[PDB]
Design a binder for this molecule. Structure first.
Ligand SMILES: NC(=O)c1ccc[n+]([C@@H]2O[C@H](COP(=O)([O-])OP(=O)(O)OC[C@H]3O[C@@H](n4cnc5c(N)ncnc54)[C@H](O)[C@@H]3O)[C@@H](O)[C@H]2O)c1
Ligand SMILES: NC(=O)c1ccc[n+]([C@@H]2O[C@H](COP(=O)([O-])OP(=O)(O)OC[C@H]3O[C@@H](n4cnc5c(N)ncnc54)[C@H](O)[C@@H]3O)[C@@H](O)[C@H]2O)c1
Ligand SMILES: NC(=O)c1ccc[n+]([C@@H]2O[C@H](COP(=O)([O-])OP(=O)(O)OC[C@H]3O[C@@H](n4cnc5c(N)ncnc54)[C@H](O)[C@@H]3O)[C@@H](O)[C@H]2O)c1
Ligand SMILES: NC(=O)c1ccc[n+]([C@@H]2O[C@H](COP(=O)([O-])OP(=O)(O)OC[C@H]3O[C@@H](n4cnc5c(N)ncnc54)[C@H](O)[C@@H]3O)[C@@H](O)[C@H]2O)c1
Ligand SMILES: O=C[C@H](O)COP(=O)(O)O
Ligand SMILES: O=C[C@H](O)COP(=O)(O)O
Ligand SMILES: O=C[C@H](O)COP(=O)(O)O
Lengths: 333, 334, 335, 333
């Protein structure tokens, strides 16, 4: 399979295309579905507030984009069942709208002529992949799969290394995270969630996330062993995840950092840093997660020990590099 | 006089309408609110405000009402104004703050729904349009639907009126450096047809069209067609500033311009004056529509050819709301 | 009425708010002198116009050597060395030390050498009496001359830790505060002392930041000495901050039980508030508490007999902390 | 002359070095003077909040940086007259501290053994160069020259084009500009300038600038014909300049836009756009100024006409590209 439709050409949907070109995937996006015109999609693709100008030529006609000299159809169907995927023969849908995050909802893509769906968010109790953690669980019979959230892709590799080296008995996560499209520009209704209604660039806003709660889908041994949440803050992209764990062994900071370093060695998904970086330094990361040995903290009172480990993530472009790794393998099975 | 008000669109402007009415102990009673959400969520937004802080009065709710300072306010959720049941609590004057009924044709739906008069919190085409303390004497008993134009009009008009009256404005162009609002985007993505409006508002200087100068003739007839302008939307949450560059009808000094302005702001509850070195956060919470800033006045001249730059601040939320309320109170007593 | 005469050293974010709060509560303390590094004109400007709290609620004027605030004169000095401040000229006895440059008993001694009698330091100042009001203020006595009120973070952390310790025991814990940026940080990337991360553009980054709030908690709650660690993530909000604590407690608990204990500890407690509303950081701006526990963020994670308890409290690290500083000051002045 | 020293390794000073490497200049930076350690300078060079990771290797020693393999001496002399520029033979000093903005002040570098100084700011009535407006005025005997401000580099090529095509009779400028290190993070004393004392990322802050007032140093025919100021706003970099003029001829918008387009043709310093860009789209620009045809406004009543023209500028990297063009020419005289 090498024909891709993008449903939802948003922050994630546009960067998917950017990253496919940057890595020279043999995948071809043949169709984009969204809610707008080729003119406006072209403008958005050409000019990006977080990553700067598109590195390839971009033009449009009434019905397509022309990206690096190649044509991509543009549709504007708000219900997925009506999307004409058959027209250009889109095989794998990268479902990036947020409105089809369940196998039953995303079935609509298959009913409409697609063969597979890769959902760019948590999508309940379905197969959910963090690349370089559990991508060996994918087979040729999977049709609709999830790559969870950016926060999952941050948390999972760090949890996996800790669990493998020391065991995690129980833990809780807080991610201090860049604001996203699901939040509000000015104070006003945003569905049912009271905190999501508040001005995002003017507030620290507590925010629910299932990344720890559903980690069992990616690291079966940790099912039910973690909880967590987010604090959304006023940065445009670039985020950090802290995990406080009770481990299966007594450890030093140095031991923990070394075990992590080893986990990140020749691991294109998971990086390491012992530099004094800040969030803007992760913008444009090609990792899903970058463990930061400078923030490791072991609090020990006799037999009791709390371990705080911290990893950075570009919740836009970093997460996208993982989505694309999963896509490229999904495409071959 | 009319005393019962309905608010359509309990948004940034709608909520501050209620706050200001209670603040000035108005005899006007808000008896109903129409929006698209639950009392619960409206109560949460009313209690907790990112720009102005905690609501200064008690807030509770029921399944179909808010209870504000102990007084019950009906809450409806009709997306079409014609369907709002304004007669249930006898709402007489609707303060129309949704942005979706900005014409006479559109807003007369509230009259079909049982109201008596409508005051629109935005420009609404060529209808009677009032900047209080500029042209509020043009209101009369036969006006049924009226506009108070934009925050930018309320900032620009008193400054332009004073310049027009003292010196003449032959021609001018405005630029307002303005706080971002709800019509903009949190992250880069579609926002109707306007390409700039699609960009992340708190991360960019964004050029932005406004009719404030173009439609100024509704408020100052002598300046009809004599002004143009635009906005640069920037990352501040509220508090904005408007610059006007004019060819005036007289050779002037900065001191003469500033004195003329100071005079126009004397005994004027709508239009303030400052010669302090203020910045935008100092205007948040202002009870004026516009505050002229003498420290920014600039006269550029080569021979007879003279450009005059005058600058006024405005709290595009609360300050504008104070103008809306002054107009509302007068409108209720005609 | 005790009419102690106060001097403020460092008329900065905290120093200016100290005056605001004293006037707001109609304190019997008289502020008679201020020392900074600048002119009365500039201090008058900054006092009148505040980016976080708006217009000063009283009149402000200046002369060549004073501020006039609501009609009352306050002498202005500009002595970069505290020993040279003429605190005796207007009789300033209690100095509120808000510069960041005298954060020890030995450094703040200079105010006593200059003729003051007591110093209250608006920051951690090592192993000296360190007070969080309504946690350990009953340790002050008539013999104290130099005392600390620790950091805003300590004032947020301590009341929540004290309630938890008193109700359930805390065996061990780690804190992270997601916190507004302050004057120690940088506007644009550039050198800022030795702290590399402090060099980075504060309104454009999430910046990890060290704080002693957890590590030194034993000054305030002696039973918890050595049992807590923690750090901050500084973020682009101008004021208003939140502190999370993850604890192993001495007994198994439910979220309700933790929230009820905290509720009880906040009852009739002018220093420590409670909320169960879904507030965000701007809702804490101008708080008159040092800390507001947020029951909505309580989380119990348990596997077998292993339990992690996460408890969360807001704080306005400027005005909120200042209200604690003032309560301490008022008591410290009556002894 | 090919050996350079940088005084002030700040936003401008570090980007000077970045741009010299980027263009593979033959200029050799042999020394840097600042107030801090090599360790801290290395960290700042490597990690940049506006422009991301340094594209070359960076290490340090107790008295040096090692950048792309090459040693650069680091001094910490707060008085320029004490900088030991003769040790590594620095001939031309790029003066980027802001503390030596006059001939009399920057003479110190020549006393310290340098031969020439290029000041990264306005510096009074001395030779002042906006590259591709008046760089022809640089002379073999000049030893101290200025490149004015970022705002001047934005305004001048627009003013030159208008003046050449139509005449500017009189004009006034407002730049809506990114905040800079002369401002304050929190409200507090900032020398004598009261507006500069205010929290820069939380305010619109009027700010005086000489860009227009001193335009006659760059375009002598416009001496005394312009005034202007800035409004500093909460964006980290990327700015815009509006100019309102009385021109010597009646014009259409198309005519103004066409004249500006011609002036930008084969002009490495002056770009054009008719795209609906916003400030983030200018970040990383290699122009001193980019005229934006989309904002052109002609306001006419009878025989009176006001003409508003608008150009974008990256007040950091864009201006630095102009500084380096000027330095390259200067070094060969
Ligand atoms: N932004 C992040 O940090 C991030 C990271 C990882 C995963 N995700 C996930 O990826 C998905 C997309 O997030 P995003 O931040 O790009 O959101 P976004 O809001 O930027 O983009 C959504 C896009 O989908 C379009 N859209 C909405 N409804 C549609 C419909 N019915 N049909 C077609 N197009 C539709 C919108 O026009 C928009 O272009 C979400 O499920 C989100 O949870 C986001
Ligand atoms: N924010 C400002 O600076 C400002 C200043 C002056 C005037 N205005 C004008 O006031 C109006 C409101 O602006 P705002 O900033 O308060 O916008 P907002 O988006 O904050 O509020 C709009 C409110 O109306 C509600 N709504 C939308 N469609 C509706 C419908 N069909 N029926 C009932 N309720 C509906 C929304 O739920 C929201 O609560 C606009 O016309 C705007 O131009 C805004
Ligand atoms: N969030 C907060 O801002 C906060 C909260 C609690 C405690 N504190 C503490 O309070 C103190 C002040 O913090 P701030 O935020 O008000 O800092 P600030 O930088 O806003 O204020 C410092 C003031 O001290 C003056 N100053 C510096 N050196 C001086 C000297 N040698 N003599 C006289 N004046 C001098 C400065 O000019 C400035 O006005 C620090 O110790 C800080 O840790 C700050
Ligand atoms: N940032 C901009 O947008 C911009 C654009 C054009 C020109 N400039 C100008 O360039 C100059 C530098 O601006 P910047 O934004 O890089 O400022 P900055 O504050 O970022 O850098 C100044 C550097 O000089 C150092 N320094 C200060 N005093 C010193 C001394 N006495 N000796 C040696 N080093 C010293 C500082 O430690 C810092 O590294 C100024 O003249 C400024 O007007 C700035
Ligand atoms: O509420 C759902 C998400 O947690 C919000 O943002 P996101 O979907 O872009 O990650
Ligand atoms: O709690 C935080 C401190 O009081 C922060 O202080 P600071 O102003 O010294 O950064
Ligand atoms: O424009 C006047 C000041 O010099 C401020 O900023 P800048 O010097 O970095 O341009």
């Amino acid at each position: 399979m090498s024909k891709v439709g993008i449903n939802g050409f948003g922050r994630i949907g546009r960067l998917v295309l950017r990253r496919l070109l940057e890595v020279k995937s043999n995948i071809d996006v043949v169709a984009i579905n969204d809610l707008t015109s080729p003119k406006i999609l072209a403008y958005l693709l050409k000019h990006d507030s977080n990553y700067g100008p598109f590195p390839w030529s971009v033009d449009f006609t009434e019905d397509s984009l022309i990206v690096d000299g190649k044509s991509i159809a543009v549709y504007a169907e708000k219900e997925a069942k009506n999307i004409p995927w058959k027209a250009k023969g889109a095989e794998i849908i990268v479902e990036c709208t947020g409105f089809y995050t369940s196998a039953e909802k995303s079935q609509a893509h298959l009913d409409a002529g697609a063969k597979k769906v890769l959902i760019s968010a948590p999508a309940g109790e379905m197969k959910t992949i963090v690349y370089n953690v559990n991508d060996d669980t994918l087979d040729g019979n999977d049709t609709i799969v999830s790559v969870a959230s950016a926060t999952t892709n941050c948390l999972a590799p760090m949890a996996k290394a800790l669990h493998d080296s020391f065991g995690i008995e129980v833990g809780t996560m807080t991610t201090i995270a860049a604001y996203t499209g699901t939040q509000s520009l000015v104070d006003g209704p945003r569905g049912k969630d009271l905190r999501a209604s508040r001005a995002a660039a003017e507030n620290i806003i507590p925010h629910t996330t299932g990344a720890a709660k559903a980690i069992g889908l990616v690291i079966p041994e940790l099912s039910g062993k973690l909880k967590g949440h987010a604090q959304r803050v006023p940065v445009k992209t670039g985020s950090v995840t802290e995990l406080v764990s009770i481990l299966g062994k007594k450890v030093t900071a140095e031991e923990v950092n070394n075990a992590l370093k080893q986990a990140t060695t020749n691991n294109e998904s998971f990086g390491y840093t012992d530099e004094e970086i800040v969030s803007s330094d992760i913008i444009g990361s090609h990792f899903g997660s970058v463990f930061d040995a400078t923030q490791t903290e072991i609090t020990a009172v006799g037999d009791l020990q709390l371990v705080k480990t911290v990893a950075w993530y570009d919740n836009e472009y970093g997460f996208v590099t993982q989505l694309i790794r999963t896509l490229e393998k999904f495409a071959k099975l």
